[PDB]
Design a protein around this nucleic acid. Structure first.
Lengths: 302, 46, 104, 49, 49, 49
DNA sequence: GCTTGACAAAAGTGTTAAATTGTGCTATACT
DNA sequence: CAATTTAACACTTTTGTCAAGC
C-alpha cells in the first residue's frame, strides 16, 4: 500500500510530554516576538550588535525548529483521528493530510499558559478540518456544508425511524420526526442521490458499458431542421406579396432581420409615425395574412 | 480537410499544452447542485 | 432504450454569417509578460483586469482604474498569536529567553 | 548537507530528475554506448546496444 | 479522476504557502504523483483506484 | 510541483531509465520520495579543499 | 392617410426581507 | 455568525387598446 510508507515515516520522532510542549510553545512565542523586534529595529535601521545579532538569529531559528518538531510529533494523533472516517467519500491519505492541516492550525492557536495538554486542544481542530474536507470534496456535485448537515440528519432520523417502526418509513414519518414539510424532505432526498458511472457494465458483461443504449432527447432531427430552412424562405416570399410599408412593419415588429421585437415607438421612427397607425397597419397585415389564400400555404409548420 | 498525406506524433514540452488550453481549471467543482448550470473556473466551466 | 439530455438547448438558426455585429478588441498583459487579446463588444466600459488563458490576471495595456479592490491580507502568525497573549508578556518572555542564551 | 552544503546539492522526487536532466548532454551517452559496443565483449556490449 | 488531481494539487499550493514541514510536503507531492499516474494509467503502478 | 509521465517511467524497458543510467528500481525510489539523489557535485571546489 | 386623449395590464424601480452559502472556533485526555 | 443571493411588493414607467376627426 501507498500509506504504509507514511506510517514508517511518522515513527522517526517520539511522543512529547506536557512540560516539553510548554517550553516548545514558549520558544515559539519568543522567536515570533524576536522576529517582530527584528522588524521593529530594521524599520529604524538600528545597529544590532554582532554578538546579539548571532544570538537572535539562533533564537528565532530555534523557535522555527521547535514549531517543526511540535508539528511532527503529533502525526500519530492526526492519523489516529483520521482513521475514523475511512471507507466513505474520501481517501485515507487525503483525510490524513486534512488532519495535518487541522493540526497545523491547532499548533497555530495552542496556548501553553492554560496548562492544558496539546492532545485535547488539537483534537478539536483536526476533527473540524477532517469534517470540512469530507463535506466539501466527497462528492462530484458539490453540496454546501449546511445541506450536507441536513442530509446527514435526514439519514440519521431515517435509520432511527426504520429501526423503531420496523418498516420502510414513508416520507410522512420522516417529516413528522424531522418537523419539516414533506416537500422539503423530498427535495433533500433527491439531492442526496449519487450519480451512477456512465462506464458501468449494463448487460451482465462488457459488450455494452452503459451509454451505448442512451438516446439524446435534444437530438438534431433532420426533417425538422430542413423544414425550418424552408419556412423562413416561405415567409420571405409571402411577406414579399405585401406592400413595402406593410411588409416592413411586420419584418421590423418581429425582427426577421435583426431579431429585436421593436416596439411601436421604435417603429415610429420610420416616418415619425405614432404607435396607433403602426398598430393599425400591423392588424391589417395580420388580417391579410391569416386568410386561407396565404395561410393555407403555411398551415403545416404549426 | 481531405488534404492529408501523413500523420506524425511526438512529445509535448508543456508549451504545446499551454498553447492548446483555453484556460486552466482552478477548482474541482463541476456543476451546481440544485441548479444544473456549470460552475465557473472549474470543470465544465463555460 | 434509456433517454438522456443536457442543459445545452439547441437552436435551429441557420445564420452562420447572416448577421454581423460591431466589436472592439482590448489587449491585456499578464504579470509574467504574456499578452492576450479579447474582442469585447462596443458596450459600456472595458474591464480593467481579465483572467487570461494562462490563468494569471492581466491588466489592460492602456492603463487606468488604479483600484486594488479592498486589499485584505490573511491573518498572519504574529497577528494570530497577538490575541492569546499581552504584548508585555511577550516582552518578558523574550527577555527571559535572552537571559538563557546569555548564560548558555 | 549540513557539513558540506556549499559543495554538493541533493534533491528528491520528480524535481530531482528534472534538475538532473536539465544539464544532461545527449551526445555523450550515445558516444559512450558506441565506444562500449566497439569495445565490449559480453553482456556489456548487449546493454550498450 | 481529474478532480482527484485538483484536490491534491490545490492542497499542495497551500502547504507551500504557510511553510509546512518537509514530511507533509513530501507526502503531498507523492499523492500528486500517484494521482497523475492514475489519471494516465489506472493500475500501471500499485493497485488501481 | 513537476510530475513524471508514467508511460516513459514504467514499461520494461523504462525509456527514462535508459536515457539516464539510473536503474529501474533507483528511479522508483527517487520519484516516489523514498531516496535522495545528488543532482550536482562541485568537483573542482571539493578537490581544492 | 394619419394623430390626440383616455384608459389598461405588463415590464421595471428601488429597497427590504428571507433563504442560501462560506467561515472561524470548541481547551479532561486520547498518538 | 456575516456575507451573498434571491423573492417580494408598493409603486413608476413603457407599452398596447378604443372612440373621434382634422
Amino acid at each position: 500500500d501507498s500509506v504504509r510508507a507514511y506510517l514508517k515515516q511518522i515513527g522517526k520522532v517520539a511522543l512529547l510530554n506536557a512540560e516539553e510542549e510548554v517550553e516548545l510553545a514558549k520558544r515559539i512565542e519568543a522567536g515570533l516576538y524576536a522576529t517582530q523586534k527584528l522588524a521593529e529595529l530594521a524599520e529604524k535601521g538600528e545597529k544590532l550588535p554582532v554578538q546579539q545579532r548571532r544570538d537572535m538569529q539562533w533564537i528565532c531559528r530555534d523557535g522555527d525548529r521547535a514549531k517543526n518538531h511540535l508539528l511532527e510529533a503529533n502525526l500519530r494523533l492526526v492519523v489516529s483521528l483520521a482513521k475514523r472516517y475511512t471507507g466513505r467519500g474520501m481517501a485515507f491519505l487525503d483525510l490524513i493530510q486534512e488532519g495535518n492541516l487541522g493540526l497545523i492550525r491547532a499548533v497555530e492557536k495552542f496556548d501553553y499558559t492554560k496548562g492544558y495538554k496539546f492532545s485535547t486542544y488539537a483534537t478539536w481542530w483536526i476533527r473540524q478540518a477532517i469534517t470540512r474536507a469530507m463535506a466539501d470534496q466527497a462528492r462530484t456535485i458539490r453540496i454546501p456544508v449546511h445541506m450536507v448537515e441536513v442530509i446527514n440528519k435526514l439519514g440519521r432520523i431515517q435509520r432511527e425511524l426504520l429501526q423503531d417502526l420496523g418498516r420502510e418509513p414513508t416520507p410522512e414519518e420522516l417529516a413528522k420526526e424531522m418537523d419539516i414539510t414533506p416537500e422539503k424532505v423530498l427535495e433533500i432526498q433527491q439531492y442526496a442521490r449519487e450519480p451512477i458511472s456512465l462506464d458501468q457494465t449494463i448487460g451482465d458483461e462488457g459488450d455494452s458499458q452503459l451509454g451505448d443504449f442512451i438516446e439524446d432527447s435534444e437530438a438534431v432531427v433532420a426533417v425538422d431542421a430542413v423544414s425550418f430552412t424552408l419556412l423562413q424562405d416561405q415567409l420571405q416570399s409571402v411577406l414579399e406579396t405585401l406592400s413595402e410599408r406593410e411588409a416592413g412593419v411586420v419584418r421590423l415588429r418581429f425582427g426577421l432581420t435583426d431579431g429585436q421585437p421593436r416596439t411601436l415607438d421604435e417603429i415610429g421612427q420610420v416616418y415619425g409615425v405614432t404607435r396607433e397607425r403602426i398598430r393599425q397597419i400591423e392588424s391589417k397585415t395580420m388580417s391579410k395574412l391569416r386568410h386561407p389564400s396565404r395561410s393555407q400555404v403555411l398551415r403545416d409548420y404549426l | 480537410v481531405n488534404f492529408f498525406d501523413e500523420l506524425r506524433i511526438g512529445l509535448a514540452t508543456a508549451d504545446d499544452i499551454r498553447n492548446w488550453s483555453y484556460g486552466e481549471v482552478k477548482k474541482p467543482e463541476t456543476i451546481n447542485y440544485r441548479t444544473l448550470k456549470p460552475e465557473k473556473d472549474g470543470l465544465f466551466c463555460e | 432504450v434509456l433517454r438522456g439530455s443536457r442543459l445545452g438547448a439547441v437552436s435551429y438558426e441557420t445564420d452562420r454569417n447572416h448577421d454581423l455585429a460591431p466589436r472592439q478588441v482590448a489587449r491585456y498583459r499578464t504579470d509574467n509578460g504574456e499578452e492576450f487579446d479579447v474582442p469585447f463588444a462596443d458596450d459600456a466600459e472595458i474591464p480593467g483586469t481579465w483572467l487570461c488563458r494562462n490563468g494569471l490576471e492581466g491588466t489592460l495595456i492602456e492603463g487606468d482604474v488604479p483600484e486594488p479592490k479592498k486589499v485584505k491580507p490573511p491573518r498572519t502568525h504574529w497577528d494570530m498569536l497577538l490575541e492569546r497573549r499581552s504584548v508585555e508578556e511577550l516582552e518578558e518572555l523574550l527577555k527571559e529567553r535572552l537571559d538563557l542564551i546569555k548564560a548558555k | 548537507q549540513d557539513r558540506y552544503g556549499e559543495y554538493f546539492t541533493g534533491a528528491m522526487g520528480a524535481e530531482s530528475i528534472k534538475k538532473l536532466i536539465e544539464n544532461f548532454d545527449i551526445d555523450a551517452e550515445a558516444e559512450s554506448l558506441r565506444e562500449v559496443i566497439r569495445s565490449g565483449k559480453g553482456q556489456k556490449k548487449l546493454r550498450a546496444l | 479522476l481529474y478532480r482527484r488531481v485538483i484536490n491534491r494539487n490545490n492542497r499542495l499550493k497551500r502547504l507551500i504557502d504557510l511553510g509546512a514541514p518537509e514530511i507533509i510536503v513530501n507526502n503531498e507531492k507523492r499523492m500528486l504523483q500517484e494521482s497523475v499516474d492514475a489519471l494516465f494509467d489506472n493500475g500501471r503502478r500499485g493497485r488501481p483506484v | 510541483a513537476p510530475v513524471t509521465h508514467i508511460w516513459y517511467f514504467k514499461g520494461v524497458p523504462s525509456r527514462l531509465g535508459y536515457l539516464l543510467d539510473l536503474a529501474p528500481k533507483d528511479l522508483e525510489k527517487i520519484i516516489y520520495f523514498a531516496a535522495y539523489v545528488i543532482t550536482s557535485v562541485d568537483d573542482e571546489m571539493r578537490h581544492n579543499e
